[PDB]
Amino acid sequence: PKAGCEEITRQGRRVVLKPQEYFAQHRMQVWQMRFKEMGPPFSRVWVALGGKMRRRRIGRQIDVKDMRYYWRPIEPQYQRLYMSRLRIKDHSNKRVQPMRLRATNNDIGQASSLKEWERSSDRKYGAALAPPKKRDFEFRV
């Protein structure tokens, strides 16, 4: 009667809650292996290894075949690019810090430290990163 007066009387599809994503999606693994983020608070380098360290060695300079061995920082122009996908976790909240590259030990439990998980004995206190579970010697599938 008002929105369309005939489009809203005959009925089409009704939309519902839209499922979310893996909310540690942007710590993708081409950094969880390439880099590692070191540093005290408010200065986090993402130190990365040498560029030429596997391809062509014979004949390259003697004292530059080793500049490939140091944990150099990546220049901040890329620090801010990669760490941009991590900030988006709660934007406009000027006091939440960015997601970290690796999962710090206290936040993993922060998921199961929630008033709703207190009743899941399994998966609490670390069960994934726990050692593999041990079962009855008769356990079988």
Partner 1 sequence: VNQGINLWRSRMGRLHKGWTTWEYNRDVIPDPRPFPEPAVNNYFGRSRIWNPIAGKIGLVNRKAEEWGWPHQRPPPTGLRRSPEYFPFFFSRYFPDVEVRLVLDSVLNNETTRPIFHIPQDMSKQELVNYLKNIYNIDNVVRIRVRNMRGRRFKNEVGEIKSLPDYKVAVVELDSPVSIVFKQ
Partner 2 sequence: GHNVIKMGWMKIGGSWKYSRSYNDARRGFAKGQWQERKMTPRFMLAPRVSAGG
Partner RNA sequence: AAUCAAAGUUAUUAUUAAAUAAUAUUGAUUUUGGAUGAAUUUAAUUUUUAAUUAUAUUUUUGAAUUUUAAUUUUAUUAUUUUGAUUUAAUAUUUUUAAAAUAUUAUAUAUUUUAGAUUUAAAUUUGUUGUUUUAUAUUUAGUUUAAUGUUUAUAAAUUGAUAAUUAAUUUGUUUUAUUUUAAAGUUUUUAUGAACUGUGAUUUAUAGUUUAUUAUUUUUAGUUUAAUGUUUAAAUAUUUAACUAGUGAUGGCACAGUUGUUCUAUAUGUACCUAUAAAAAAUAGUAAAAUUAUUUUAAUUAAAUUAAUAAAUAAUUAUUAAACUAAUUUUAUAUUAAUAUUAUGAAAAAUUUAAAAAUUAAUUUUUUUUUCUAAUUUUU
Partner RNA sequence: UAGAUGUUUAAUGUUAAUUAAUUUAUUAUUUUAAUAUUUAAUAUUUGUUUAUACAAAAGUAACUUUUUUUGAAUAUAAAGAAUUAUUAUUAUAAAUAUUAUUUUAAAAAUAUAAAAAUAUUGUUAAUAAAAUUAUCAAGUUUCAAAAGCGUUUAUUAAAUGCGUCGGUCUAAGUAUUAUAUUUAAGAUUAUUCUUGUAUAUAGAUUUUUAUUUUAAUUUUAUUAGUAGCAUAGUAAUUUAUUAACUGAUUAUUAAAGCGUUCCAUAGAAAAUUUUAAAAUUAUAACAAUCUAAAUAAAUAAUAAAUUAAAAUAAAAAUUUUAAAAAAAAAAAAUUAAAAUAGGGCAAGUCCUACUCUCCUUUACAAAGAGAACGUUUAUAUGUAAUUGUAUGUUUGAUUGGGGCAAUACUAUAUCUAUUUAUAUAGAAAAAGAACUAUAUUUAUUGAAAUAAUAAAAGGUUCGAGCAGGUUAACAAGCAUUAAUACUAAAUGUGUUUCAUCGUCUACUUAUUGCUAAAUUAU
Q: Which does 73 bind (CB under 5 to 8 A by kind): partner 2, partner 1, RNA, none?
A: none
Smallest distance from partner 1 to CB 3, Å: 17
- Candidates 6, 94, 137, 138; binder of RNA (CB under 7 A) is 94
- Candidates 6, 7, 35, 39; binder of RNA (CB under 7 A) is 39
- Candidates 1, 135, 136, 140; binder of RNA (CB under 7 A) is 1
Cβ 26 vs Cβ 88: under 8 Å: yes
CA distance 121 to 136: 19
Q: 88: helix, coil or strand?
A: helix
Of 1 and 19, CB closest to partner 1: 19
Cβ 108 vs Cβ 125: under 8 Å: no
Of 9 and 93, CB closest to partner 1: 9
Q: How many CA atoms lie within 13 A of 67 on its CB side?
A: 7
Between β-strands 72-73 and 36-38, what pairing exists: parallel, antiparallel or unpaired? Answer: unpaired
70 binds RNA (CB under 7 A): no
Of 24 and 72, CB closest to RNA: 24
Of 98 and 124, CB closest to partner 2: 98
CA distance 82 to 16: 33
Site string for partner 1, 5-24 (x = CB under 8 A): -----xxxxxxx-xx-----
Distances in Å between the alpha carbon of 29 and those of 24, 26, 69, 101? Answer: 11, 9, 21, 10
Instruction: By CB under 8 A, name the binding residues for partner 1.
Output: 10-16, 18-19
